[PDB]
Structures are given as structure tokens and as C-alpha cells.
Design a protein around this motif. Structure first.
Motif, PDB file in Angstrom:
ATOM      1  N   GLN A   1       0.146   4.341   0.878  1.00  0.00           N
ATOM      2  CA  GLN A   1      -0.047   5.185   2.055  1.00  0.00           C
ATOM      3  C   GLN A   1       0.664   4.608   3.271  1.00  0.00           C
ATOM      4  OE1 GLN A   1      -1.417   8.023   0.906  1.00  0.00           O
ATOM      5  NE2 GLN A   1      -3.623   7.907   1.276  1.00  0.00           N
ATOM      6  N   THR A   2       0.253   3.423   3.706  1.00  0.00           N
ATOM      7  CA  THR A   2       0.853   2.741   4.843  1.00  0.00           C
ATOM      8  C   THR A   2       1.686   1.575   4.339  1.00  0.00           C
ATOM      9  OG1 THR A   2      -1.036   1.264   5.167  1.00  0.00           O
ATOM     10  CG2 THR A   2      -1.092   3.401   6.275  1.00  0.00           C
TER      11      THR A   2
ATOM     12  N   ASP B   1       0.835  -1.197   0.000  1.00  0.00           N
ATOM     13  CA  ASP B   1       0.000   0.000   0.000  1.00  0.00           C
ATOM     14  C   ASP B   1       0.873   1.252   0.000  1.00  0.00           C
ATOM     15  OD1 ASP B   1      -1.782   2.220   1.239  1.00  0.00           O
ATOM     16  OD2 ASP B   1      -3.208   0.588   0.922  1.00  0.00           O
TER      17      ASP B   1
END
Ligand SMILES: *[C@@H]1O[C@H](CO)[C@@H](O[C@@H]2O[C@H](CO)[C@@H](O)[C@H](O)[C@H]2NC(C)=O)[C@H](O)[C@H]1NC(C)=O
Ligand SMILES: *[C@@H]1O[C@H](CO)[C@@H](O[C@@H]2O[C@H](CO)[C@@H](O)[C@H](O)[C@H]2NC(C)=O)[C@H](O)[C@H]1NC(C)=O
Ligand SMILES: *[C@@H]1O[C@H](CO)[C@@H](O)[C@H](O)[C@H]1NC(C)=O
Lengths: 50, 50
Positions: B35-36, B33
């Protein structure tokens, strides 16, 4: 190398000689035969297009 | 990278530069991912022949 088909064996043939076995061997040999494949199915539309 | 699947947590450890993941059949199965920084296993949605 040129392959050899097998080892030479001139059988001692004559018109009044017979070879009679005086013993025997109980031989067990394996034979492997495929019987079935994996059963597969396809979703043709999903495969082609998703 | 777009598609359809079920996203779950994965115990595979990506190297930090890697983003995508592919199996033996060269199909996407895990993505990191953006984002994270976690790795989500993408299993296909449960299709079947009726
Ligand atoms: C039966 O006799 C023949 C000859 O009398 C044997 O044949 C000989 O066998 C030896 C070894 O097997 C060879 O070195 C010879 O060259 C063979 N001679 C001939 C003319 O073929 C034969 O082996 C005998 N069989 C048994 C079961 O004893
Ligand atoms: C026929 O052959 C068998 C083996 O193929 C012989 O049995 C062997 O006999 C010897 C001594 O008699 C033993 O030391 C072996 O342990 C035996 N082998 C097995 C597998 O049992 C048998 O004696 C032979 N018979 C004749 C009449 O020749
Ligand atoms: C991006 O933002 C998320 C949420 O604040 C944060 O967890 C992450 O560390 C940030 N940086 C990167 C490189 O993903």
C-alpha cells in the motif's frame, strides 16, 4: 615439487668429543588452545514447525 | 509471504523493484508494504528458553 623434510645436518659424533654451550637464548613461544565453543540451544518444536 | 514477527521502521534502502529482504541465513527480515512504499523491518517475536 617433492617436499624436503629438512636441511641436512651430520652431527660431528666421535667417542671423545662433547659440545658444551657457552651461551643461551631466552625464547618465548606461543601456544594457542581452544577452550570453549558458543553455547547454543534449539527450540526443536519451533525450529521444525514454527 | 506469511509469518510472525515484530514490524518496525528500517533504515535500509530497497531498490524500487525489490519487495522482500533476506539476511545472511536466508530468512526474511524486511518487506516493502504494497500500500505505502515503506520498508518495515521484521524482527522475530522474542522467544526464549525458560
Ligand atoms: C667440532 O668439530 C667438527 C669437526 O672437527 C665440526 O664438524 C664440521 O663442521 C663444519 C661446519 O659446521 C662442516 O663443514 C664439516 O663438514 C664438519 N666436519 C665433520 C667431520 O663433521 C663441528 O662443526 C665442530 N663443532 C663446533 C661447535 O665447533
Ligand atoms: C651471549 O649472547 C648474548 C645475545 O644472545 C650477547 O649479548 C649481546 O652482546 C653484544 C656484545 O657483547 C651486544 O652488542 C648485544 O646487544 C647483546 N645482545 C643482547 C640481546 O643483549 C652476549 O654478549 C653473549 N655472551 C657471551 C659470553 O657470548
Ligand atoms: C496506493 O494507495 C496509497 C494510499 O492512497 C498511496 O499512498 C499509494 O501511492 C498508491 N499507489 C501505490 C503504487 O502504492
Amino acid at each position: 615439487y617433492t617436499m624436503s623434510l629438512g636441511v641436512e645436518n651430520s652431527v660431528a659424533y666421535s667417542n671423545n668429543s662433547i659440545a658444551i654451550p657457552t651461551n643461551f637464548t631466552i625464547s618465548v613461544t606461543t601456544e594457542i588452545l581452544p577452550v570453549s565453543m558458543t553455547k547454543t540451544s534449539v527450540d526443536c518444536t519451533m525450529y521444525i514447525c514454527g | 509471504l506469511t509469518g510472525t514477527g515484530v514490524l518496525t521502521e528500517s533504515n535500509k534502502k530497497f531498490l524500487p523493484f525489490q519487495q522482500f529482504g533476506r539476511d545472511i541465513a536466508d530468512t526474511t527480515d524486511a518487506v516493502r508494504d504494497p500500500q505505502t512504499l515503506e520498508i518495515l523491518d521484521i524482527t522475530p517475536c522474542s522467544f526464549g528458553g525458560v
